[PDB]
Amino acid sequence: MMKRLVYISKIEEIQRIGKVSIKNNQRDNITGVLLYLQGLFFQILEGENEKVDKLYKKILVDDRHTNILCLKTEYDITDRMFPNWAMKTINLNENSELMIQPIKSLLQTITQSHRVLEKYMPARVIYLINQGINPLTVEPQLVEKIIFFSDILAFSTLTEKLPVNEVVILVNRYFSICTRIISAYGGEVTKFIGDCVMASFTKEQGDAAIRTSLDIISELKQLRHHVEATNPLHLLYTGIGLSYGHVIEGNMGSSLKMDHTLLGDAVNVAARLEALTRQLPYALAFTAGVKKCCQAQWTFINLGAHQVKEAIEVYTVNEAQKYYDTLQITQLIRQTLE
Amino acid sequence: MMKRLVYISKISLEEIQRIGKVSIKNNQRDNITGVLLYLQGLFFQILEGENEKVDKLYKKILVDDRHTNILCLKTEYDITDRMFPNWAMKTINLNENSELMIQPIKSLLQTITQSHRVLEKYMPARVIYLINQGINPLTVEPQLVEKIIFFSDILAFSTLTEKLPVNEVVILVNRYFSICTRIISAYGGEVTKFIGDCVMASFTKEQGDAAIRTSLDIISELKQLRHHVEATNPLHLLYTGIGLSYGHVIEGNMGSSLKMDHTLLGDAVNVAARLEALTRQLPYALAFTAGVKKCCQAQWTFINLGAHQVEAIEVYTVNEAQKYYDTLQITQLIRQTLE
Numbered sequence: 001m002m003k004r005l006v007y008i009s010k011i012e013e014i015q016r017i018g019k020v021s022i023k024n025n026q027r028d029n030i031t032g033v034l035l036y037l038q039g040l041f042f043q044i045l046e047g048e049n050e051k052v053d054k055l056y057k058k059i060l061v062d063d064r065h066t067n068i069l070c071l072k073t074e075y076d077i078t079d080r081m082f083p084n085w086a087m088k089t090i091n092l093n094e095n096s097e098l099m100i101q102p103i104k105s106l107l108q109t110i111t112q113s114h115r116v117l118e119k120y121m122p123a124r125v126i127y128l129i130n131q132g133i134n135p136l137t138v139e140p141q142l143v144e145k146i147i148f149f150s151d152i153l154a155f156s157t158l159t160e161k162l163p164v165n166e167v168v169i170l171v172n173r174y175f176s177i178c179t180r181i182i183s184a185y186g187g188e189v190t191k192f193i194g195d196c197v198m199a200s201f202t203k204e205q206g207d208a209a210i211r212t213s214l215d216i217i218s219e220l221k222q223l224r225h226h227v228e229a230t231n232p233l234h235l236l237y238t239g240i241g242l243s244y245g246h247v248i249e250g251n252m253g254s255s256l257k258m259d260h261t262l263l264g265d266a267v268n269v270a271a272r273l274e275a276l277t278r279q280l281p282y283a284l285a286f287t288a289g290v291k292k293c294c295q296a297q298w299t300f301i302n303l304g305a306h307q308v309k310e311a312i313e314v315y316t317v318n319e320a321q322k323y324y325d326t327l328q329i330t331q332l333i334r335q336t337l338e
Numbered sequence: 339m340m341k342r343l344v345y346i347s348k349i350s351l352e353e354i355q356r357i358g359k360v361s362i363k364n365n366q367r368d369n370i371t372g373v374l375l376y377l378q379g380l381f382f383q384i385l386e387g388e389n390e391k392v393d394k395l396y397k398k399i400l401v402d403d404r405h406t407n408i409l410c411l412k413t414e415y416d417i418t419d420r421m422f423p424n425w426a427m428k429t430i431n432l433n434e435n436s437e438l439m440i441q442p443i444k445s446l447l448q449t450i451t452q453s454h455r456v457l458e459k460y461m462p463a464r465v466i467y468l469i470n471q472g473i474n475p476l477t478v479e480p481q482l483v484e485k486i487i488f489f490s491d492i493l494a495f496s497t498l499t500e501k502l503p504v505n506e507v508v509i510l511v512n513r514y515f516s517i518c519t520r521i522i523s524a525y526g527g528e529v530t531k532f533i534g535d536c537v538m539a540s541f542t543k544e545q546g547d548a549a550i551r552t553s554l555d556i557i558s559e560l561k562q563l564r565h566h567v568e569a570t571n572p573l574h575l576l577y578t579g580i581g582l583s584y585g586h587v588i589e590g591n592m593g594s595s596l597k598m599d600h601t602l603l604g605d606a607v608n609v610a611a612r613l614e615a616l617t618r619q620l621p622y623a624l625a626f627t628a629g630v631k632k633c634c635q636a637q638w639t640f641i642n643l644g645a646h647q648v649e650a651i652e653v654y655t656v657n658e659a660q661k662y663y664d665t666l667q668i669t670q671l672i673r674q675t676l677e
């Protein structure tokens with residue numbers, strides 16, 4: 001019982017790789033091809049499922065290539081695609097045969113475009129593709145999730161005073177910090193909504209959601225004093241709202257336009273809790289449901305009941321206390337660029 | 339000096355070899371050369387020649403019956419040498435080539451291509467437009483542009499998600515997105531993203547009339563949809579409210595290397611979303627700002643809804659958007675239906 005997987009990755013040393021591959025693939029009864037064109041890697045692997053997943057696990061951690069996307073996984077294949085090739089390496093760059101020049105140039109234009117599109121896809125969708133699962137045909141399921149929401153404090157004022165490029169530098173720097181921190185703790189960013197970041201966590205990731213929130217506030221606090229006063233990054237603040245509940249996670253839309261979205265009351269609650277941090281001396285606020293997903297011991301602070309558009313309990317942690325004032329900031333932002 | 343463009347498309351031998359006959363004859367009288375390759379129901383074509391000769395030719399290929407979902411991937415300008423000087427139009431049937439050496443390239447081309455096709459469906463319409471124009475969307479700078487922000491969402495959606503089984507909520511939301519995306523695109527709008535049950539789109543400042551007709555068409559097609567199905571279908575309960583605004587917004591792609599997204603930043607984006615919720619409290623399913631009103635040339639029968647705290651802004655609508663129903667009785671009827 002064998003399987004076949006195909007992946008692309010971003011890059012004489014290659015000849016050393018192919019010879020080591022022929023050595024190990026024979027020993028592991030693995031067949032397949034490695035093709036490379038214009039600094040790109042294309043490899044097809046096939047063999048028994050145990051020995052293949054053992055091999056692919058090594059190649060994912062290889063130094064020489066990165067941006068490794070597994071496009072297709074075949075299970076229970078009937079016949080080997082290349083039964084005689086332990087690991088045939090094909091340098092498409094050196095191939096000057098004029099009957100393959102179109103297909104070779106088409107394999108580049110489509111692959112270059114395919115990587116550009118990958119950077120816009122939702123994180124969950126890319127995960128589904130790496131697992132050999134067709135994202136269009138995955139039944140949306142009801143799952144218990146922690147909803148994350150973070151946006152820039154007083155962003156309306158910042159668009160008024162700053163020129164366009166400084167606003168874009170700022171918004172990009174904010175998204176970059178959020179995504180890297182969220183992804184590092186295991187959270188899945190769903191989409192950017194204006195200046196708002198939306199992510200989710202599994203119900204066992206209550207501590208990671210709180211720690212992600214604290215780490216984002218920390219990385220922004222460092223950035224503000226790490227740069228000069230004229231740098232617009234000196235004005236970057238955030239508030240974060242978390243919520244727990246059941247949501248429908250899946251792919252909605254038409255064949256024309258499709259997206260990955262979460263449907264549920266908790267989505268709006270986390271968004272409304274986030275906007276509440278403008279009126280609290282805490283850059284973080286979450287429901288009691290998030291509080292009950294946390295195994296670790298936090299010094300939880302009760303902020304009372306608040307009416308969210310009946311009133312729910314709102315909490316925070318002692319680490320997330322603001323040293324500044326929300327009004328002091330909107331003034332010091334307006335007056336800095338005044 | 340010539341231009342060269344590449345595109346993929348989807349199929350709708352003797353019927354196809356005929357395309358080679360007609361095209362070879364014209365490509366020489368047009369001083370055009372290129373290759374046409376097809377594999378597992380997909381079309382690939384490269385072209386080159388004087389710009390005027392290619393622009394007029396690609397316009398004919400764009401409206402051809404025998405293929406659909408055409409996407410131009412690459413476009414190079416100011417080239418010296420033709421990549422294929424010998425062939426006015428050489429067809430290649432990769433489904434009928436099995437030289438051993440070509441098998442890896444062939445299997446890789448269909449896989450990468452299918453995957454590419456899937457990714458397009460998730461791409462924002464604006465990113466696809468930049469790809470069609472041959473412009474790398476990753477290197478484009480965001481700019482301040484004047485837009486009409488479109489906002490619409492499903493009425494009483496919190497009630498439906500509670501009463502309906504999960505698989506039935508999906509059908510309703512898919513159908514709603516399907517109707518909105520179809521109408522918004524047909525009027526020259528760009529769906530920018532779905533936000534839960536919410537649809538956000540944008541129209542240029544010359545499309546004020548297209549923005550209103552888009553909103554009335556969506557209300558019309560849902561009203562038609564409601565009485566087209568049975569009363570036990572979830573679609574019998576699908577209503578909508580729409581809000582529009584006009585203002586300067588920063589349109590452009592943003593994000594890190596990990597995640598990129600095309601988004602709109604501006605005061606008007608929030609102003610539009612507040613109007614879509616204001617329709618709950620109005621006898622009209624549509625509500626737009628006075629800025630949208632000045633983008634319309636058609637003699638609309640505008641209705642003034644006064645100023646509204648959001649400092650206050652003027653709210654307008656058209657008589658065609660009048661709700662033939664009470665909004666509050668609808669939220670009651672939806673509950674007492676699935677109850």
Ligand SMILES: Cc1cc2nc3c(=O)[nH]c(=O)nc-3n(C[C@H](O)[C@H](O)[C@H](O)COP(=O)(O)O)c2cc1C
Binds near residue numbers: 041058087
């Ligand atoms: C593009 C690429 C293709 C590779 N192909 C193979 C392969 O076909 N077979 C294989 O065993 N390893 C392959 N590798 C990875 C190396 O085998 C692996 O990183 C290393 O040789 C581990 O060897 P070791 O067992 O001595 O520790 C590939 C790596 C890259 C970057």
Ligand SMILES: Cc1cc2nc3c(=O)[nH]c(=O)nc-3n(C[C@H](O)[C@H](O)[C@H](O)COP(=O)(O)O)c2cc1C
Binds near residue numbers: 365
């Ligand atoms: C996939 C495809 C590729 C085509 N490529 C060319 C082409 O390269 N040159 C050309 O003259 N016609 C090409 N055609 C034909 C045009 O679609 C058009 O129908 C044809 O030029 C009709 O010629 P007419 O203007 O005399 O009616 C192509 C058609 C298809 C379906």
